Symmetry: D2
Subunit: 177 residues, 4 copies
Amino acid sequence: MVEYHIPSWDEIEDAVFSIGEALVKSNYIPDVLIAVLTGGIIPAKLLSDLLDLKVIRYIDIKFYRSVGKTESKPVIRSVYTDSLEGKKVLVVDDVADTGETLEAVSNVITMFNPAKVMTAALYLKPWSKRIPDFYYKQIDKWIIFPWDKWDVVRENSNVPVDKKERFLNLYNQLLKI
Amino acid sequence: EYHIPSWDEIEDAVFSIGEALVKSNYIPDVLIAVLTGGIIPAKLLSDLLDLKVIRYIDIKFYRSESKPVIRSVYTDSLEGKKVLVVDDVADTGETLEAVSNVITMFNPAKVMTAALYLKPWSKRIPDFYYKQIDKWIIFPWDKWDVVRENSNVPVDKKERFLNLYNQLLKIRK
Amino acid sequence: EYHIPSWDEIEDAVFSIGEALVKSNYIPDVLIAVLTGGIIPAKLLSDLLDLKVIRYIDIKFYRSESKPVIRSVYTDSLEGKKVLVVDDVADTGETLEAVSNVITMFNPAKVMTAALYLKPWSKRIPDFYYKQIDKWIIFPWDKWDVVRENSNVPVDKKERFLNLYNQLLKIRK
Amino acid sequence: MVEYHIPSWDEIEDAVFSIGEALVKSNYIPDVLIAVLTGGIIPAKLLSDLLDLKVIRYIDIKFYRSVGKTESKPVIRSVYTDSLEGKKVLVVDDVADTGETLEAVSNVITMFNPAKVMTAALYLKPWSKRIPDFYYKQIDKWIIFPWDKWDVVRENSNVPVDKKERFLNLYNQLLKI
Ligand SMILES: Nc1nc2c(ncn2[C@@H]2O[C@H](COP(=O)(O)O)[C@@H](O)[C@H]2O)c(=O)[nH]1
Ligand SMILES: Nc1nc2c(ncn2[C@@H]2O[C@H](COP(=O)(O)O)[C@@H](O)[C@H]2O)c(=O)[nH]1
Ligand SMILES: Nc1nc2c(ncn2[C@@H]2O[C@H](COP(=O)(O)O)[C@@H](O)[C@H]2O)c(=O)[nH]1
Ligand SMILES: Nc1nc2c(ncn2[C@@H]2O[C@H](COP(=O)(O)O)[C@@H](O)[C@H]2O)c(=O)[nH]1
Ligand SMILES: [Mg+2]
Ligand SMILES: [Mg+2]
Ligand SMILES: [Mg+2]
Ligand SMILES: [Mg+2]
Ligand SMILES: [Mg+2]
Ligand SMILES: [Mg+2]
């Protein structure tokens, strides 16, 4: 499809393996993962299991780009971590588009005085203002992840995703309350 | 001896629970993900049902007579809200019990629980679950922890992992 | 009918508790301040005893059959630590009980409690306190909340406050 | 004293009244107070009671300037707040010296996209890089607050503070364990 990239779970595992493999090549084994909620949740958990990283923390930050709510920049809603001083930190997200979210998170994490902050995203857009330190693939269309496919379907009746009928039947019932 | 759900099955597990919540007419205001096994289930359930508020509790259970230990609770007020606690497996049931007990202290309008899978000997049954299973469940999100314990478990992509793990052993720490 | 401690008395209350902790040989690893009445006592106690780790719990009790309601818990791991929960007054004792109960879920090595003042009818007695008092205590940190309730309470600087409060009523909201 | 300012509790109350009075003059009634832990704790609580402000949140941030630990800039250890979007926020600290702490906190709070962020400190030093939006007095010596007087005494056997003998007897016992 020209307008969407719809990766399978197998591609997501390949993406996470690739990040892990790159981390080991660079000898950057993080002390702490910072998952960018909520798109970075699954990537961070999978990477954590892959590399036996026992410490995951979280930042709730969102780039509002919808009909109901539109903003110019990412907005932090909360930061879920204690001291990161002297730690090697890796920020993990599912995709860097403009790169503003990773920049915002990097900036705020740097205020915790870690030993090092680096960034990882599964996917990168050509127009991103900064290349993440670690990434799996550059792609120039909108990515539909397995964990936000139904949000896309809700906003877009056209898109072809697996299990759509089962979802529509459920969504239908939700809409009637 | 082992149950190793595909991502396809995990999706069906989440669909199952989402359908039960809808059929039973319980639509959560807030999901509490039990870290870290519950975070992928919670995320998938949030997407399916369009639940915009996910909060988290860092809790651990060192099985061998232990009790669950809370390390942190990441949430603000839950008062007056319908909460669904979400975890990946209910084995002893201690974790869900502990989480429900602390969430109740936030005076929500209701707390219910959900886990993808349930063990026969669980002291408490989740309000919502996909399947009860006798075998040891290897999740897509903890398959390498299991392999690092026993290398001979029959999971896919094990060679790619062992390749990586080998290098990892040399550079850490 | 009223007890209105000076800052001098508050200091002596904190000294009293600090001396009791030292005499009794319990030196906390972590203070849990019960927000918001406990935060000034906790800060003063932290300075006296050189306690560098203060954490917090946002909890409220709407007296008229209610229960304390937790709004958030601000702490990471307490496991293996000696904790002292700190509040300004123990009236019904429900708040301290609730806080102790949730902190125990973090598996600390010990939780003890402290409040500056104690009411005769408290269901639970703080492990450390300064004085039991029958009167309604007006703290230096909630004197204006009391005045806003009843203007005729005998606190100092009330005219400066009413002057300010009057302007405040006009511009809010 | 040329080297220390040691305010009484009555002066602290005067300071908090003055901030409150200035807030009302400016018609800036905050929705949320951000207390800068731990020096801003007492000022924020007193201001909260004074102006009936029911929402107080917290940031744990420290400027290490001691023998045991020295740093160039403030370091955030944790941020205790949920969404501040669209709120009028007032950052409250006990003193602005270099002004780096208030700057750091203002910067991070601005990432939460509040309607407005302003700052208040009881005291201001002449060499501060920015004047807080609200303050009680400018002073050019080290302030010993009622809530960190014993920390000063521990680091400095000379300073004259009330109740020192009672403290030394206690400190003595602490040191022997
Ligand atoms: N599903 C999906 N989410 C995206 C896409 N691009 C950006 N996002 C979301 O927006 C953030 C990145 O936006 P940025 O700040 O890089 O513009 C990420 O945290 C990600 O969750 C996309 O193509 N597909
Ligand atoms: N991957 C996996 N972990 C399990 C399984 N059964 C129990 N556990 C772990 O063992 C504990 C069981 O106690 P409970 O989860 O009921 O508190 C939890 O820490 C849980 O993560 C299982 O079948 N598969
Ligand atoms: N200022 C003040 N507040 C009190 C006094 N007694 C009770 N309260 C308030 O009433 C409640 C008493 O219940 P408890 O504190 O034991 O949970 C708390 O919310 C406490 O702050 C008092 O004597 N003075
Ligand atoms: N006790 C005391 N603390 C100070 C003094 N100056 C700065 N501080 C502490 O350091 C911070 C301000 O430092 P700045 O970032 O403005 O250099 C405040 O949060 C305050 O707690 C002082 O003169 N006396
Ligand atoms: Mg995102
Ligand atoms: Mg998104
Ligand atoms: Mg778990
Ligand atoms: Mg209280
Ligand atoms: Mg300070
Ligand atoms: Mg200081």
